[PDB]
């Protein structure tokens, strides 16, 4: 069970990571395109900051 | 007046006058009815363009504008256009 | 010094850009509105539901009966982007010297009778020049001064 | 004297749902290859391969346990393609030490050796860099695709570490090896 | 006049393939062991309220049931919304209609004009969840086979996306409309109402969902949702 352990300790730290590709953060959309398809740069360029 | 921007569309923006989207100045109007009205037929603007300007380019070129598929020469016929129009100024128009 | 040093990355890029999409094939009835055989005036009227229709309007343009085409709203490149709700279309009659009176705030012959209009209907025009239809006892047609 | 008439097209928007508008039409799908892709609004890009997976007919694409799309049905021929992405690795430079000499070897990390010449633009490069691009110093590890460097049949001690058991070092004119590691 | 749900009434909330997956979702739902009502026939339509949802069932013998009126003000004067199936196909049509006080089929009825849009499409148990939501209008439904007596069963089975409409309109009531032999003008069927809620969702190989938990019912649930995981 000590070895088991550090298998799904770095397993679970890795499916965080990716799930958190669909947060938005406060910004339109968590989507990089559809920000870049339905606004222009000037103010573009504040959401995807 | 809202077309002098940095980052704004409309036939000014895209066709005449570009400001680039990183600008460093300031842009300056005033109402000159006093002046420049009475029309007028020689203060002109483009309507037709085959690619929108890059930031900072003029263009004086009174080529035709296929705006139909076949094309014409020389006359404006069907679907042939010529670029320049005027504005249409008199004292009796509302602000705008 | 010596080692093992990483330095770059890369990356294959792609070669074309494909578009997939459904078969347009809800197409909409465009024959029996112009290329009928009876026409209204200012008199009468027609509103139609122009809905449940996604057909195109290259042959509206590209065609070699429609004359005049002017537009503020959109150009005719891309007609595909914008869909439209509440797509409404009336016929009418009118004579000939009185094309250019259809305007944003429009002071001609017919802007008391033909309801002169601000640029709140945006959106192009279509002239068909009939020549063997309209000529010759087809006075059935109305107008008020 | 002639019956003039036109139309003025409709009023304002975002305003109620099926509209009225022109068509979208579609480019013939290719696969096997890295492309751009644009399934009904889902925008990628990828490596199209047909799939052995079958799925319910309301259902349009797949995804997995971490949300990622993974599969998509074309709109036209009711196929289901897989998705794979194109190629990325590391690029990582072997050498001895400026100090010592000034010859160097490339390791790319998870490609065939085959695949390396588009990877990196080979044509768009210096001409001294498409010298570890092909070539007869070619070797397939496990690691990756390592370039530059020759593969000997003698063990020695670990020098310049690679993985899964393969080290190199400078060697007797002279060059650059690549060995599996002996334990004693 | 009151039964329980058990866990009937769950459909599939997007057009996502998923397999061996058990997913998390917050959509509206039908609550597991509520109290839904009941309607018989047997000697009973009245004017129900559509709050963020309504799920139906109704199960029969002989094809008494049709269709359904919606609407807001059932006044002729606001834009209504109907379905009737009269086994030949089906008819959405969105007239304004004129309306009685008891809209049956006889053994018909259509006063329809400034409309909008239309469309053409014991061993029973029916399922119709109806929803309403950014002006759309959907259908989830399934038809299915019993072994009892007149209870709504204890399995599984998830009710599938039949059809999407883009109506627009705003929406506050409903009827049923089922026929009867004699003509009687004067001048069986089960309601839930669908709640917020949050389901685990079990994915099984070829893709079907075929278990949940209502991660609100009890201690135990909030424990598997916490987990995300059916055993623990
Ligand atoms: C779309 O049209 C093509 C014709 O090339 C046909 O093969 C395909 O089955 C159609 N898809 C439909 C009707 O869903
Ligand atoms: C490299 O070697 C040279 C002589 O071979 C020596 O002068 C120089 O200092 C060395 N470089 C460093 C960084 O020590
Ligand atoms: C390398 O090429 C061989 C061909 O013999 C192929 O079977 C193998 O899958 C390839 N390895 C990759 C692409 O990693
Ligand atoms: C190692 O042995 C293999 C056996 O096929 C041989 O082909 C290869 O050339 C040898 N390499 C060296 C440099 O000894
Ligand atoms: C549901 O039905 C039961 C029948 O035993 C009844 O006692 C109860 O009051 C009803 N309502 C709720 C909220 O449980
Ligand atoms: C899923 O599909 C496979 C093959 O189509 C079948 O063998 C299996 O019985 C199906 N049902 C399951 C896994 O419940």
Request: charged share 15%.
């Amino acid at each position: 069970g000590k070895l088991q352990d550090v298998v799904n300790q770095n397993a679970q730290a890795l499916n965080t990571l990716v799930k958190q590709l669909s947060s938005n953060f406060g910004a339109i959309s968590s989507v990089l395109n559809d920000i870049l398809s339905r606004l222009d740069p000037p103010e573009a360029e504040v959401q995807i900051d | 007046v809202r077309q002098i921007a940095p980052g704004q569309t409309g036939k000014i923006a895209d066709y005449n006058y570009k400001l680039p989207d990183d600008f460093t100045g300031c842009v300056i109007a005033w109402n000159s009815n006093n002046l420049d009205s009475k029309g007028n037929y020689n203060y002109l603007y483009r309507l037709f363009r085959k690619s929108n300007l890059k930031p900072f380019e003029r263009d004086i070129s009174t080529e035709i504008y296929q705006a139909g598929s076949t094309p014409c020469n020389g006359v404006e016929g069907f679907n042939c256009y010529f670029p320049l129009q005027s504005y249409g100024f008199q004292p009796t128009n509302g602000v705008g | 010094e010596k080692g093992i040093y990483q330095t770059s990355n890369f990356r294959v890029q792609p070669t074309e850009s494909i578009v997939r999409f459904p078969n347009i094939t809800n197409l909409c009835p465009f024959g029996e509105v112009f290329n009928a055989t009876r026409f209204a005036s200012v008199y009468a009227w027609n509103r139609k539901r122009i809905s449940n229709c996604v057909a195109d309007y290259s042959v509206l343009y590209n065609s070699a009966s429609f004359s005049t085409f002017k537009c503020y709203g959109v150009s005719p490149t891309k007609l595909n982007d914008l869909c439209f709700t509440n797509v409404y279309a009336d016929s009418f009659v009118i004579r000939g010297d009185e094309v250019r009176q259809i305007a944003p705030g429009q002071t001609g012959k017919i802007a008391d009778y033909n309801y002169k209009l601000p640029d709140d209907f945006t959106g192009c025009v279509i002239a068909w020049n009939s020549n063997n239809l309209d000529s010759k006892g087809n006075y059935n047609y109305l107008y008020r001064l | 004297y002639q019956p003039y008439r036109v139309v003025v097209l409709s009023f304002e928007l975002l305003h109620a749902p099926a509209t009225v508008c022109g068509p979208k039409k579609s480019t013939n799908l290719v696969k096997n290859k890295c492309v751009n892709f644009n399934f009904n609004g889902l925008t990628g890009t990828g490596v199209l391969t047909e799939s052995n997976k079958k799925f319910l007919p309301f259902q349009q694409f797949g995804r997995d346990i971490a949300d990622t799309t993974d599969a998509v049905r074309d709109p036209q021929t009711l196929e289901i393609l897989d998705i794979t992405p194109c190629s990325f690795g590391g690029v990582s430079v072997i050498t001895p030490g400026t100090n010592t000499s000034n010859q160097v070897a490339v390791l790319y990390q998870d490609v065939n050796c085959t695949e390396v010449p588009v990877a990196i633009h080979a044509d768009q490069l210096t001409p001294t860099w498409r010298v570890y691009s092909t070539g007869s110093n070619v070797f397939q590890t496990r690691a990756g695709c390592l370039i530059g460097a020759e593969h000997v049949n003698n063990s020695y001690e670990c020098d310049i570490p690679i993985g899964a058991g393969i080290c190199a070092s400078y060697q007797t004119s002279q060059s650059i090896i690549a060995y599996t590691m002996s334990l004693g | 006049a009151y039964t329980n749900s058990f866990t009937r009434g769950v459909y599939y909330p997007d057009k996502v393939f998923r397999s061996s997956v058990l997913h998390s979702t917050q959509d509206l739902f039908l609550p597991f062991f509520s109290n839904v009502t009941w309607f018989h026939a047997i000697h009973d339509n009245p004017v129900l309220p559509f709050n963020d949802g309504v799920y139906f069932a109704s199960t029969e013998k002989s094809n008494i049931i049709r269709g359904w009126i919606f609407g807001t003000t059932l006044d002729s004067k606001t834009q209504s919304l109907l379905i009737v199936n009269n086994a030949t196909n089906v008819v959405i049509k969105v007239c304004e209609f004129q309306f009685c006080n008891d809209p049956f089929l006889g053994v018909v009825y259509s006063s329809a004009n400034n409309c909008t849009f239309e469309y053409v499409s014991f061993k029973n148990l029916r399922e119709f969840v109806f929803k309403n939501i950014d002006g759309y209008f959907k259908i989830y439904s399934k038809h299915t086979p019993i072994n009892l007596v007149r209870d709504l069963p204890q399995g599984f089975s998830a009710l599938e996306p039949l059809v999407d409409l883009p109506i627009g309109i705003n929406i506050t009531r409903f009827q049923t409309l089922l026929a009867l032999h004699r003509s009687y003008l004067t001048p069986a069927y089960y309601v839930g109402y669908l709640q917020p809620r949050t389901f685990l969702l079990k994915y099984n190989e070829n893709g079907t969902i075929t278990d949940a938990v209502d991660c609100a019912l009890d201690p135990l649930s909030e424990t598997k949702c916490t987990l995300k995981s059916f055993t623990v």
